[PDB]
Amino acid sequence: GKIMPNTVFVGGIDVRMDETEIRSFFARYGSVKEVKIITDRTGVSKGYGFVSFYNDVDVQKIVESQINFHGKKLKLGPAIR
């Protein structure tokens, strides 16, 4: 599959975090285009999702800047089709 530019995978999303909180947070990295929280067939979060940006954002640099992978922290990664 192909690495999606300007999109970041977000793992470990708490049930309390919503699309607005995610949008608000990721605005610090650029103009946010879409936030998708992946849900099961009942529309309950599976605990992960994707954030895409309008602009060229250096997603790999953001991913590589993570230093704390404790359970509560969001796990960022590249988004691959």
The domain that holds 10 is classified in CATH as 3.30.70.330
Sheet of 32-39: strand order equals 32-39, 45-53, 3-11, 75-80
CA atoms of 61 and 72, how far apart (whole Å): 21
Look at the chain and report how many structural domains it folds into. Answer: 1
Q: 58, 53, 55, 48: which is closest to 12 by C-alpha?
A: 48
Give the domain extent around 74.
1-81
Resolution in A: 1.7
